[PDB]
C-alpha cells in the first residue's frame, strides 16, 4: 500500500497536480513511519508547490488591492478575494505544521539531526509563510514561532553537520531571509547568510561530483541575497 | 529584485 | 454585482485561479443576459485554462498508461489515476456545454450570426475534448455531438463570416483538428484546411494592421498543421 | 499533435 501512495504521488508530481501530491504524501507521513530520502523530498515538493501558488496568488492580489477609483465596491470585493487565498494558504501552513509537530519531527530520534534540521526548518519556513500574510496582534506568535524553529534548527547543524551540507547551507538561507524580510534585521541577515557563506567557502574542496550541485545552488543564493541587500 | 529562498 | 463578478474574473486571472474565474464567469452566464465580447472572451480564457489543465495532466498520465511492462498493480494505480484526471476534465466539458445550451447560445437573436458561430465552435471544442478521452459507445455519441455543432457553425460562418475573420479561420482550424485527430479523417482534414487558408488569402490586402495580426496568426496555425500531417 | 486556436 506504502508503495503505492508513493507512486501515487509521483505520478500527480508529474501531471503538474500538486493538490494530489500532497494529500498522497499526507496520507504517507499519517502511516507514523519515518519517511525515506525520496519521500521527504517528494512531501517537500508537493506542499511547496501547493503553498507557492497560494503565496504567488496573495502577492498579486495584496499589490493589485493597494490600487483609487472610490469604488468602495470594487475595493471590498478585491480584500474579500485576497482573505479567500489567505484562508487557503493558512490552512495549507497548519496541515503542514500539524505534519510537522504530530509525526515527522516527534518521530526524529535524539541523533537524527539532519532529519531534525530538515522538519525543524521547515516548521520555520511554514511559520514564515504565516507571518508573511499576518496582520496585527496575532502576527507577533507566528514570527515568534518561525524564529523558534530555525534557531533550533541552526543550533543542531551548526554543532552536528558540516559547512557544505546542502540542508545546512539552505537552513541558513531561509533562516537570514527571515531576518530581511520578516524582521527587517538587515545586520542579522547579512551575518547569518555571510557566515554560512563564507564557512562553506573554506571546506569546498570538501565536496564530491554529485555533492557539489546541491550546495552551490544554495551558495549562489546566499551570494545572491548579499548582492541584494548590501 | 526580491529575496530569494531555497528552492 | 455583475461588474464585481467581472472584476473579480479579471483578479482571478492574474492570480493564475481559473477554477476561480471559471466560476465567476459561469455566474455572469447565468444572470440570463448576452455577454458582451469582453465578457464572452473572459469566459472562454477561463475554461479553455480550467480544461486545459485537466487535458495536460490527462495526456501525462495516459502515457505513462501506455508504457505500463506487465506489472498489473502498477498498471492499476496509473489507470486509476487517469480515469480521476479523466472524470474531472468530463465534469468541465458538462458544465461548458451546459452553459452553452441553457444561456449563450439559446440567448443568440437570430441576427447574432458572430455569436453563433463562436459558441457552435465552443461547443465542437468540448464535445471534442470529450471524445479524446472516450472509448467505446459513449466516444460514438461525443463524436457525433461535436460534429454536429461544427457543422452548424461552418455553415452559418461560410454564408454570414468573411473569409479572413478570426472566428471563421479559428472555427476551420478546430474542425480540421476534429478531423485529422477524432474522425482519423486527413483527406478531409486537409480539404478543410487548405480551402480556408485559400478563402482568406483573397482578401488579406483588405485588413487593417489589428485585423492582420489575429487572422495571419491562425493561418499560420493552419499551415502548421497541413505541412504535420503531410 | 496538430495545434487548436
Known amino acids: 500500500d506504502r508503495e503505492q501512495l508513493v507512486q501515487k504521488a509521483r505520478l500527480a508530481e508529474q501531471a503538474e497536480r500538486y493538490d494530489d501530491m500532497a494529500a498522497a504524501m499526507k496520507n504517507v507521513t499519517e502511516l507514523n513511519e519515518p519517511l525515506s530520502n525520496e519521500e521527504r523530498n517528494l512531501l517537500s515538493v508537493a506542499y511547496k508547490n501547493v503553498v507557492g501558488a497560494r503565496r504567488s496568488s496573495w502577492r498579486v492580489i495584496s499589490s493589485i488591492e493597494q490600487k483609487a477609483d472610490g469604488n468602495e465596491k470594487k475595493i471590498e470585493m478585491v480584500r474579500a478575494y485576497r482573505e479567500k487565498i489567505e484562508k487557503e494558504l493558512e490552512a495549507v501552513c497548519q496541515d503542514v505544521l500539524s505534519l510537522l509537530d504530530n509525526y515527522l519531527i516527534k518521530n526524529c530520534s535524539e541523533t537524527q539531526y539532519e532529519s531534525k534540521v530538515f522538519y525543524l526548518k521547515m516548521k520555520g519556513d511554514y511559520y514564515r509563510y504565516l507571518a508573511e500574510v499576518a496582520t496585527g496582534e496575532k502576527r507577533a506568535t507566528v514570527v515568534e514561532s518561525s524564529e523558534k524553529a530555525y534557531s533550533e534548527a541552526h543550533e543542531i547543524s551548526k554543532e552536528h553537520m558540516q559547512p557544505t551540507h546542502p540542508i545546512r547551507l539552505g537552513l541558513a538561507l531561509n533562516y537570514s531571509v527571515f531576518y530581511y524580510e520578516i524582521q527587517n534585521a538587515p545586520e542579522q541577515a547579512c551575518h547569518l547568510a555571510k557566515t554560512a557563506f563564507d564557512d562553506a567557502i573554506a571546506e569546498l574542496d570538501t565536496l564530491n561530483e554529485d555533492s557539489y550541485k546541491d550546495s552551490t545552488l544554495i551558495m549562489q543564493l546566499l551570494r545572491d541575497n548579499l548582492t541584494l541587500w548590501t | ?7
Open chain 2, 1 to 7: 529584485p526580491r529575496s530569494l529562498s531555497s528552492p
